[PDB]
Amino acid sequence: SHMALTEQDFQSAADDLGVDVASVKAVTKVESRGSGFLLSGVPKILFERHWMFKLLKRKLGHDPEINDVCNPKAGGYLGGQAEHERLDKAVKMDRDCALQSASWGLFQIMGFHWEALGYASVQAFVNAQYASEGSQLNTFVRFIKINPAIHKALKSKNWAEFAKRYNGPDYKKNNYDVKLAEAYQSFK
């Protein structure tokens, strides 16, 4: 109920980035999934078995065993609470790699970014996904900071450049450059 973002959270992030409050609301409206939590109260995730293969391959120094939650071929997605059963299975192979191989919260940030984002450990990154949407928004803010090119675009309010660098070269297919601008106006 209170787990959802508030003006207090939007402003903390805006101040932390050093940008307009409406700019943070804009990207949150488009780049987020509305809620960063499922019904049970656990974070919204999507498990990437090909990242589980890559990360566990780096750790061991050889190919791991290929199953339905560890495979160099991307896909096999279930969805919602079902994704947490895939994570639980992957945790029994290797906890750190599994947790790192899922995208977490509002902005679906991959858990292997934990170190670049400046968290004490993998477990610190996860606890921040369980805490609140405000913490999940802090994670997003941290991702924007470590991408100066994307951070500058947000401050200069380019949208076209921000959408290109964040969403990908094929951003105009979903009208991200436009949606961001129209969203920005809806709050401004």
Numbering used by the authors: -1 to 186
Q: What did the paper state?
A:
The structure of the monomodular Pseudomonas aeruginosa bacteriophage JG004 lysin Pae87 is presented and investigated in relation to repurposing its function as an antimicrobial agent. The structure of Pae87 shows that it is a one-domain protein with the typical α/β lysozyme fold.
The protein without and with PAO1 peptidoglycan was crystallized as described in Section 2. The best apoprotein crystal diffracted only to limited resolution and with somewhat streaky spots, but the best peptidoglycan-bound protein crystal diffracted X-rays to high resolution with cleaner spots. The apo structure could only be refined to relatively high, but not unreasonable, R-factor values, while the peptidoglycan-bound Pae87 structure could be refined to more satisfactory values. The apo Pae87 and Pae87–peptidoglycan models have two and one molecules in the asymmetric unit, respectively. Molecule B of the apo structure is less well ordered than molecule A, as shown by the average temperature factors (68 versus 52 Å2, respectively). There is one amino acid with disallowed Ramachandran values in the apo structure: Gly32 in chain B. This residue has reasonable density and is near Leu76-Gly77 of chain A. Presumably, this contact pushes Gly32 into a somewhat unnatural conformation. The root-mean-square deviations (r.m.s.d.s) between molecules A and B of the apo Pae87 structure and between molecules A or B of the apo structure and molecule A of the Pae87–peptidoglycan structure are 0.5 Å when Cα atoms are superposed. Buffer molecules have also been found in the catalytic clefts of other enzymes, such as the lytic CHAPK domain of the endolysin LysK from Staphylococcus bacteriophage K or chitinase C (ChiC) from Streptomyces griseus HUT6037. They may mimic the enzymatic substrate or product, and thus their position reinforces the idea that Glu29 and Glu46 possess catalytic activity in Pae87.
